[PDB]
Design a protein around this motif. Structure first.
Motif: not given
Length: 264
Positions: A35, A50, A55
């Motif tokens: 993150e 992102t 992720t």
């Protein structure tokens, strides 16, 4: 240098503490998460971007994994990300605690700086433990526990015939083997099928490296002129009744079942 990668990917290593091939490795996955470090600032240091980033990274263990397969690798790939400009993009990497019975999860937090040059792309990836200046590759270390079950026969007031079955779970599958010590000898109980054995007064059997979270049931054949009852002792907590034929789930405390055959 350790913890500096020239490229666009961040390697992840997972090590499961595993030192004894008689123990069944749990069939399970570990998940790593990346993150943005949302407070990163001060090249400019920016919060990690992102957009286009997968992720989650995962590694998988199964019951066939032994000493030689205890370490696994995965990665995160920054090649796929659209960065809005040059700089250092900072992320936090951790391992999810899935809360699977018997497993100890690595709670360490890692920090990752991705050096982005020229479109734009990653050039270097640097990893450290959060709150450490020491560069090193990301390695999570997990472990797991086993338990034990001892079964003893007592006679009050001859060989008695018993049946044990270890039921398969999602973590420990049918056809895998668990060790039993029986009349001094180390033998194999196969998960998901009946295992028959005998005991006379004061004789015991023990499964010393039993998987945590599986269910078992123990029965004794009817013996004429006897009534049979059993108690289950979990660690040092008080013995309660075990009804023969009932499923019992293994957990972290060492179990002892005493089956009492009382002459009528």
């Amino acid at each position: 240098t350790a913890g500096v990668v020239t490229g666009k990917t961040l390697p992840i290593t997972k090590s499961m503490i595993y030192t004894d091939n008689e123990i069944l490795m749990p069939k399970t996955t570990f998940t790593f998460t990346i993150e943005p470090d949302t407070t990163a600032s001060g090249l400019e240091i920016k919060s990690g971007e992102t957009t286009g980033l997968t992720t989650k990274a995962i590694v998988s263990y199964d019951n066939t994994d032994k000493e030689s397969a205890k370490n696994k690798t995965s990665n995160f790939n920054f090649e796929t990300v659209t960065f809005s400009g040059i700089g250092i993009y900072r992320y936090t990497v951790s391992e999810q605690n899935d809360g699977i019975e018997g497993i100890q999860y690595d709670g360490k937090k890692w920090t990752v700086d991705v050096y982005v040059g020229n479109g734009f792309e990653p050039k270097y990836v640097v990893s450290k433990e959060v709150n450490s200046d020491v560069k090193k590759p990301i390695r999570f270390e997990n472990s797991f526990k086993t338990t034990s079950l001892k079964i003893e026969k007592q006679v009050t007031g001859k060989d008695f015939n018993f049946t044990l079955i270890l039921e398969a779970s999602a973590l420990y599958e049918k056809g895998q083997v668990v060790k039993i010590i029986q009349d001094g000898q180390t033998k194999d109980v196969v998960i998901g099928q009946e295992y028959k054995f005998t005991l006379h007064d004061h004789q015991s059997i023990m499964l010393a490296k039993l998987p945590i979270g599986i269910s078992y049931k123990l029965t004794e054949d009817k013996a004429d002129g006897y009534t049979t009852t059993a108690t289950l002792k979990e660690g040092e907590i008080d013995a309660k009744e075990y009804v023969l034929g009932n499923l019992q789930k293994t957990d972290e405390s060492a179990d002892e079942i005493v089956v009492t055959n009382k002459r009528d």
